[PDB]
Amino acid sequence: HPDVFNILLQVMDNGTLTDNNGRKADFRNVVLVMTTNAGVRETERKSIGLIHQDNSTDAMEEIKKIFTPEFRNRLDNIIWFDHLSTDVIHQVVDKFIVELQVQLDQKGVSLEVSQEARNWLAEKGYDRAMGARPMARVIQDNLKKPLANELLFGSLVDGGQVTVALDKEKNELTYGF
Amino acid sequence: HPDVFNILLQVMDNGTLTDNNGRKADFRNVVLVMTTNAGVKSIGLIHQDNSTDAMEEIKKIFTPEFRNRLDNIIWFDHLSTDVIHQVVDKFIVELQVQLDQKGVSLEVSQEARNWLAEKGYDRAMGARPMARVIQDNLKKPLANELLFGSLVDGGQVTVALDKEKNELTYGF
Amino acid sequence: ALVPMVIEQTSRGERSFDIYSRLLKERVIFLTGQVEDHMANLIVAQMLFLEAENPEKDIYLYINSPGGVITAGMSIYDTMQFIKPDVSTICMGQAASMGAFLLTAGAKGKRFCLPNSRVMIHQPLGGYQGQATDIEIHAREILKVKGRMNELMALHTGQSLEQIERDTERDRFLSAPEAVEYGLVDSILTHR
Amino acid sequence: ALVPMVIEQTSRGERSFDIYSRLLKERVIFLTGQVEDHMANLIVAQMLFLEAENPEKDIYLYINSPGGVITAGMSIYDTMQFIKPDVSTICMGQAASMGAFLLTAGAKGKRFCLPNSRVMIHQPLGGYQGQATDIEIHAREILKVKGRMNELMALHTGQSLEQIERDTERDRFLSAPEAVEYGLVDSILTHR
Amino acid sequence: ALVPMVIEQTSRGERSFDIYSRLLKERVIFLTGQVEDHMANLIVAQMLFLEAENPEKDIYLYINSPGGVITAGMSIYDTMQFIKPDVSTICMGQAASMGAFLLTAGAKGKRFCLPNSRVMIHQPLGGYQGQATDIEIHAREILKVKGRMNELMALHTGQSLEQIERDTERDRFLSAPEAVEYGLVDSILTHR
Amino acid sequence: ALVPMVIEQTSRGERSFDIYSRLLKERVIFLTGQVEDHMANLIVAQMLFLEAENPEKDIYLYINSPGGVITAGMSIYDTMQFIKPDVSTICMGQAASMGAFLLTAGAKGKRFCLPNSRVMIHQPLGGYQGQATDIEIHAREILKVKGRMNELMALHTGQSLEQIERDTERDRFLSAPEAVEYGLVDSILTHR
Amino acid sequence: ALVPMVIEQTSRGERSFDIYSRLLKERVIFLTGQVEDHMANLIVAQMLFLEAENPEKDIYLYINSPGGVITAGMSIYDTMQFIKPDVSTICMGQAASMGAFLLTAGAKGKRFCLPNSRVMIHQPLGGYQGQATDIEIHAREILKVKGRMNELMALHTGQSLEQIERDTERDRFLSAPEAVEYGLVDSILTHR
Amino acid sequence: ALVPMVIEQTSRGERSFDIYSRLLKERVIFLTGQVEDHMANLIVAQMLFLEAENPEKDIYLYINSPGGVITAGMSIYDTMQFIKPDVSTICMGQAASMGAFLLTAGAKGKRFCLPNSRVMIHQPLGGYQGQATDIEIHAREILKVKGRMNELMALHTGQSLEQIERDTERDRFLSAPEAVEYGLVDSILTHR
Amino acid sequence: ALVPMVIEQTSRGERSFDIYSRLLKERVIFLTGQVEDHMANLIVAQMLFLEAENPEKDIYLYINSPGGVITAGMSIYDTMQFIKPDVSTICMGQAASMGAFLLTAGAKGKRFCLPNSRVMIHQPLGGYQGQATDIEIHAREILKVKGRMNELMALHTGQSLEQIERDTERDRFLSAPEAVEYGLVDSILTHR
């Protein structure tokens, strides 16, 4: 509720906050980070015409609409996060594959994923509008499904050495011991 | 508002409204009386106006479906000169008993009664201005003479028309 | 646009009408320019609606016309005669042959005119081109029309038929008092 | 604009119609000016809508027309004959060949006219320019049209076909009583 | 469109009027261009509505006209004289014969003009073509009209009838101070 | 305005449509005047919308046209053939070459006409000015068009191609019974 | 239509104005095309409304005109002088004799022009046809008008009357810096 | 008015659109009459809006045009090429030089035509009057335009450039099957 | 009507705009047909409103014009230079002398054109009739205008003043790549 922002006004300006018991909380040693999805609609909204505009001005307009001038005045900075590029997508895929490998090692299953398989996963999952979250689902369906089957009623019961590689005729994945 | 009409129709249909706390408003012992004017300064070269049609104007939201809930359609017409004289007499006897309860007799000349009826009644406004005209023309000088102390018990006032001033001539 | 809008507060308020509709609501109708088919038909529609509104209240037809076709004027006159409420014709500006006729055709005792208004009357005009037989037919027809107009004028003004016949032989102009004395109008409107 | 708006209170009130729509709501239709394709088609649409509204209530067609094309008049006449409710034609102003035909084509017993209205009838007009063969074709076609018009008039008025043929050879004008006696109309409207 | 709309907040707010309707709401009326039947009738309708609104408050008629037909001007003048509230005529731009007449016809003490406005007066114009008898009739009629105009001008300005007659023989232009001295207007508007 | 508005009560009531939109809501379309690009395109849009509304219910095209350009008529005919629902063409008034073609192109068993309607058919008209080669090109093109029209008419009426060719050499008029016997229409509408 | 609508959110939001009304709300008025009676009267109405809105805030009259009639320009000039708030005239495009005069008539210190705008001034034009006496009358009248225009220009620009007289003998064009040096405008608008 | 309104129930229901707006909502655009600046600009605006609505869904441009100016057609063609979604051109009625070009410029595999539609192509027309040097300049310009048109047609139809050059030397008409074989359209629409 | 309406859902939804207002909401403006006073003033009003909306976002002026009067183009150019946000001019169709000038006057780095668009430039046209002195005055004025136009073009394109002078002596047409190389536009728009 926009009425809640006034508490943050008081805190950001004075670093103190008085609860119901007259007790004052000390915020001087607390980092205050607030995450929003405001103004995103305009930035991704397509203008009508031959040339599209930078809607970052509209993002600023929307943020100013939502946050009163003094609230914007009591901020250290507003960090405008950008979308994720394709190489960033590759790195995100590497990160998620590492996490999946840790999960598998918890079960005692080593896993190797080829490089072109990583590239293919990134190409399949890259979605500019949704950032890095689609990569989680893509990796999930493309790897965990056969892996879950092999860990439940398959070869990878108390054993690993699962290799995943990509062919070029069907863009499919290898598996098995 | 038409929603008020829907509520009134609910009542006229079953006579039971539900309080928002779950209580039942029983209308079986309530007589429903609703009024409507549907009446009307004549742009142009005249000042003519006399007309009545309320069936078309409530048939608006009181559609024939709604009108089928009406137990009776009571019609009222304009007031004739004799009956405006009679309501003037009603007001006059009311003020008369009011004053006699203090010991002051009041007589209004007949032409003064006719003048009061002509000044207080308006066809487009009915007998509503009559209350104010009667009060202002009668009680006012009486109020003066009574509070000042010159008109006291044993006194009286004879209201007659000043034919050329139109003021209600009076006396002790 | 060219016709300004007005605001009226009766039931919900802010009832926006054009000025002509705002006056039609007060049972007053304007007749201007030449009398033709469409304008006369509009006048007839307005008169019928006003009759359906209240057949007892008068209808005021403000006439300012340099004439027109005899047939449309006859339509308006017949509509005025047929309807139950009285039609009070007020001649402002000027009223020529058809306009003057429609003016004098108002309800008896309610034909008015303004002090500087002008009234002109004359025999109907027309013509035809073609064969001799068709010429004769059209001539007899227009003569019947002229006779009917003279009869109606003599009826509405009280003058003798021969008087109207000898008067409307040429264009005859009449001021407001001359019109009152002639019988075309009942009285002259002066002030409120 | 030129056509004034009116206010009607039926269900929610303040129902603003133009005057022509306000009268069409009362099952009355106006026919003015020349009869052409678009105007006649508008009349046909109005008649169809009025039939769909209440096939039992009469429809009143106020006719004031100097004529028009025979084909559009035939369309209107066929629409009048086809629809179930009765069409009461009222001739105010004047009604020429096509207008007079559409007037006399009203429901039997409901063809009226106003006391000063004028009625004129004549054989249909036309022509063509071109080769002799096309000339003959168009001449035979217009003669068939004339014969059909005479047959329909003799049917609707009760006169003999030879009587209509010898009467409409030239322009023939008829007053209101002459029209009543001829059979074009049933009676003359005088007063409320 | 060409006429801009404005917003007014009285009861519910955001009352959108065209500028002319927005000023008519303030009892001010504009008279521009030539004086003809329809425009003068519009002015008459506005004046009648303003009288019905408040018969005590003045009505302001801003006049800027190169003239017009005498009859429509006479209609406007008669409407101004008849209505109860006072009509304050303000001549901005310029006012020719009919415009100047309607200007000087304002309520006594309330005829104003602007410092650079121009006023011109002259005898009425006209004419006719036809037979000698009709020529004589129309000539006598226009002479009566000229006499009536001179009488009304002498009445409203206070000048002698012979003075108006000898002055309006030709086009006579008057500046704002010349108009004030002549008596056409009461004073010149300078500043707020 | 010229086209009156009507009121319909379906869901909230007081649904104000113009008369043409009110009838289009009932899946009836009017075709009047000459057939040109914009009017035919309007008809095509209406037919497409009516198909999208209910591809099973018939569509009624009331035809009254003195002809038009062959190309717009071909557009309308192709749209009628393409859409799934049946198009019932009703010829009231009259239907010339393009109008008659669009009439006979209705759904088999649903081509009607009114008892006094007129139907005329002829070979398509045209022309060109320029060099001899372009003249020959345009002549061959119009001859191909004429052949295609004759083929389509022979298909829709059931007559032989040679019969249509020898019939439409000149203007050929057909009454309602003649049209029924010829095969252009299926039956004549008489009464409800 | 041709004039696009815009949306504004002040109290309830979604306040749809045409662009011209949307700018009039910001106390800016456009003067384009020739200066005639109706357009100048519209400008006068807008100025009066803007004065009634806030008599303290300035009014901006964007001038782009090839001239017009002297009388309508005089009306606009008198309205500008009379009203209390200051009128800032901005000449974009070009401003001819009447347009240039209305431009230089702005509030002292607030007459602007755009860097490529053009300004042209000349003696007023006119004429008359008729008898010698009327010719002389109209000539003296137009000479008085020319003298008054020269006096007003010398007043508003600060130049000598003889300087204006010798300058406006013929068409004299002025660029933006030439206009600033001449005194017609106060400064040239360059950037925000 | 002339364009009927329709009703659609999506969110609140009773969404009244004109028929053209109702179809534009379905991503279908009409191109009729001559191709000129304003109409082509309207088409461009509609195409841009439809692209902004859903860049993946096709856009259907129903073409029925006797030609137009080459520049407006080039604007439409460039807009069709630039936008991401595919433009399916459907030629109903007929499509001349500019219309045929815009038809064949549709998305490959989606250029349709109706069985009786006509297609005509020819070299662009033009001209100029003036000095010899300007004549030469304009001639070279129109020759460059003709070459560019031939190149684009050869690209979109797959025919050789020399084939298009020798074909469009004169007016060349094509039926629907001839157009399919020539490559202008992909297939002929027959039935649902 | 001719301009279709569209629906937009932002706050309450179902926001009905005409297509031109719907695009103006997206800070895109169309310039079509000849450049005249009223159209250029409309463009200026739109640009001022768009600047007041967001002085940081660009404004897109889609230019398709065969020229116009130099003064209105100068007004548009001055408005483009004055406002803070950048004006991106896109030439689709074609842009003649005034249109080409307004195109090249866009924000540096944002002047685009479409691959088949045409650009033509030439010295300004004009003329005058009258006395020798006025002839000389008008000639010197138009020569100053031509010099100013050449200076502005040399500034915006980067070419030498002598180059522009020798190039625009006659009508010079430029294709899209020729325009890019000449410096009138920055790049050619090809695809999304």
From Swiss-Prot, chain B:
Subunit organization: Component of the ClpAP complex composed of six ClpA subunits assembled into a hexameric ring in the presence of ATP, and fourteen ClpP subunits arranged in two heptameric rings. Binds to ClpS.
Domain of life: Bacteria
Organism: Escherichia coli (strain K12)
UniProt record similarity statement: Belongs to the ClpA/ClpB family.
Leader sequence segment: none
Keywords in alphabetical order: ATP-binding, Chaperone, Nucleotide-binding, Repeat
Its biological purpose: ATP-dependent specificity component of the ClpAP protease. It directs the protease to specific substrates. It has unfoldase activity. The primary function of the ClpA-ClpP complex appears to be the degradation of unfolded or abnormal proteins.
Name recorded for this polypeptide: ATP-dependent Clp protease ATP-binding subunit ClpA
GO biological process, alphabetically ordered: cellular response to heat; protein quality control for misfolded or incompletely synthesized proteins; protein unfolding; proteolysis; response to oxidative stress
UniProt-recorded Gene Ontology molecular function terms: ATP binding; ATP hydrolysis activity; ATP-dependent peptidase activity
A GO CC term assigned to this protein in UniProt: cytoplasm
Coiled coil: none
Covered range of the whole protein: 570 to 746 of 758
